[PDB]
Amino acid sequence: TTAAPLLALLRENQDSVKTYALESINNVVDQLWSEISNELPDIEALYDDDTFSDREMAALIASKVYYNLGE
């Protein structure tokens, strides 16, 4: 099955779901990466706001995606 449940959680505008999205994605960052790349911009957005503590998590996840592609 696709990553389609995982991407949907990020887009949701309630702040508690955005935190939650990365907790799931983090596990499968190396296993699915050609289906988690649509809402990679959602993950770069969360870094910009300093009201998240998930700045750390957003970068951690983000770097790894680029290497999986082979960049």
């Binding site: 449940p5 949907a8 887009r11």
Partner: protein, 266 residues
């Protein structure tokens, strides 16, 4: 709470649905934490999953009315492989049928006809072969008439679809606007000019204020009481010449010979 969302939809108050959504999305997390999200299925899992899905079903329809397309798309992605798996494991609702059909119309108006054709493949194996129609004919038929290129047939079905309710009334307005932008593209190459009463008939409009507004969006003077399609074509060509993405696509003859010469001498 999850329950209050569901009875608010049947009452007919969708403003009410709309204002229970912000608490609803926090408990929707709790519901996800209950389940292992499709990696082991149990029978205790389905009693936990009824709490999960319920939110998605009610939430999804209610978003269509309230103009919350991001949330409708979000609730659809979560919900969908649940139905697909095991030919239904239950994971079934009457409300299931309405969501598939309204979701096909959603893509089409955005002009993700690409995704429309992908999305179809999935649903044919899922329910089109097995349970026959969930009101899937309604999207598929519009698609056919756009690809066929008859806009009369398609416009006629939208007129009727707003004389019917399945929530097709909420997507007809969008697919009216979407069809109008598509025919302007076709009609640049077809005509050089038209009477203002002819453009009016063809791109479907009930005022001449609409027809000229539409013309001047496509940068076609309405002078002489005739349109002038060629005028927009000139300005698209200039836009391209200013960029450096169009100059090397052409490839000039000085460039072709010199690059030809250095392969040999290499």
């Amino acid at each position: 709470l999850t329950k209050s969302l569901s009875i608010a939809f049947e009452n007919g108050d969708y403003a009410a649905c709309e204002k229970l959504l912000p608490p609803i999305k926090i408990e929707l997390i709790k519901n996800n934490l209950l389940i292992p999200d499709l990696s082991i299925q149990n029978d205790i899992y389905l009693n936990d999953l009824m709490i999960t899905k319920r939110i998605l079903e009610v939430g999804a329809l209610a978003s269509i009315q309230t103009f919350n397309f991001d949330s409708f798309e979000n609730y659809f992605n979560q919900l969908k492989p649940y139905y697909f798996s095991n030919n239904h494991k239950l994971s079934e609702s009457d409300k299931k049928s309405k969501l598939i059909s309204l979701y096909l119309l959603n893509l089409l108006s955005q002009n993700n006809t690409t995704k429309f054709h992908s999305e179809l493949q999935y649903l044919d194996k899922h329910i089109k072969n097995l349970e026959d129609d969930s009101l899937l004919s309604y999207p598929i038929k519009l698609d056919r008439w756009l690809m066929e290129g008859s806009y009369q047939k398609a416009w006629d079905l939208l007129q009727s679809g707003s004389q019917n309710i399945s929530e097709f009334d909420s997507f007809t307005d969008i697919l009216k606007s979407a069809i109008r932008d598509e025919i302007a593209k076709n009609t640049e190459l077809s005509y050089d000019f038209l009477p203002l009463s002819n453009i009016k008939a063809l791109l479907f409009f009930n005022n001449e204020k609409e027809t000229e507004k539409f013309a001047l969006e496509r940068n076609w003077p309405i002078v002489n009481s005739k349109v002038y399609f060629n005028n927009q074509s000139k300005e698209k060509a200039d836009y391209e010449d200013e960029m450096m993405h169009e100059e090397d696509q052409k490839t000039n003859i000085i460039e072709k010979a010199m690059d030809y010469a250095i392969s040999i001498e290499n």
